[PDB]
Design a protein around this ligand. Sequence first.
Ligand SMILES: COc1ccc2nc(O[C@@H]3C[C@H]4C(=O)N[C@]5(C(=O)NS(=O)(=O)C6(C)CC6)C[C@H]5/C=C\CCCCC[C@H](NC(=O)OC(C)(C)C)C(=O)N4C3)c(C(F)(F)F)nc2c1
Ligand SMILES: [Zn+2]
Length: 197
Amino acid sequence: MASMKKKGSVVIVGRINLSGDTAYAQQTRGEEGCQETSQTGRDKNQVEGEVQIVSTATQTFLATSINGVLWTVYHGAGTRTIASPKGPVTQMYTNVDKDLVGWQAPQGSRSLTPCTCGSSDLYLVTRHADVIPVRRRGDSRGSLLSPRPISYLKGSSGGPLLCPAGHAVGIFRAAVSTRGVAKAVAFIPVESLETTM
Ligand SMILES: COc1ccc2nc(O[C@@H]3C[C@H]4C(=O)N[C@]5(C(=O)NS(=O)(=O)C6(C)CC6)C[C@H]5/C=C\CCCCC[C@H](NC(=O)OC(C)(C)C)C(=O)N4C3)c(C(F)(F)F)nc2c1
Ligand SMILES: [Zn+2]
């Protein structure tokens, strides 16, 4: 028992900048500092924006602030704490059935508003800051207007699908792949997050 290890914290390592006319990824922490911050859980970096790039020791993905909660996928974060200036922060929501977790949104983040538009013309934001049009096809599915190899979507779970007005419609969960080409995506609808809240 004496040598039983602790899994580290999720760490914010960058963000997707949507504040201007041009979407772009920004790295805010390199690999070595990420490893150190995962073990201590103490991240003194200033957080900005709605979409964070996050990492564990073994995986990197996205997390999205909606109504004061930073949300991501359970298949990325598990039950992990997130690093913050005051130390590790415990999840406030965990739902494996939805592939969903959330923590209180970091000080300095900005939150998206849940969409009430009832629109089916959506936009997926990836970890490379690509803004991909997606037609909504059901409660939890949308089609890519321009299909792409799954390589282009890998690492973007936890990112948002947005409506034309920039509201949050859902959280990207899984790619529907045929022969390595993503023609559609599965997402956690924001209504599911609102109920969890
Ligand atoms: C115990 O609790 C659990 C444990 C494990 C779970 N594993 C789950 O699925 C896994 C992970 C998820 C994935 O790869 N996600 C993305 C990503 O980027 N992840 S990632 O950031 O790289 C990351 C791995 C986090 C670092 C957006 C994808 C981008 C590219 C696709 C790559 C090819 C994979 C295609 C596959 N497609 C699929 O399964 O499609 C159907 C329709 C569902 C069958 C798919 O997408 N995935 C398979 C799910 C889910 F299914 F709910 F998602 N729940 C879980 C609950
Ligand atoms: Zn909307």
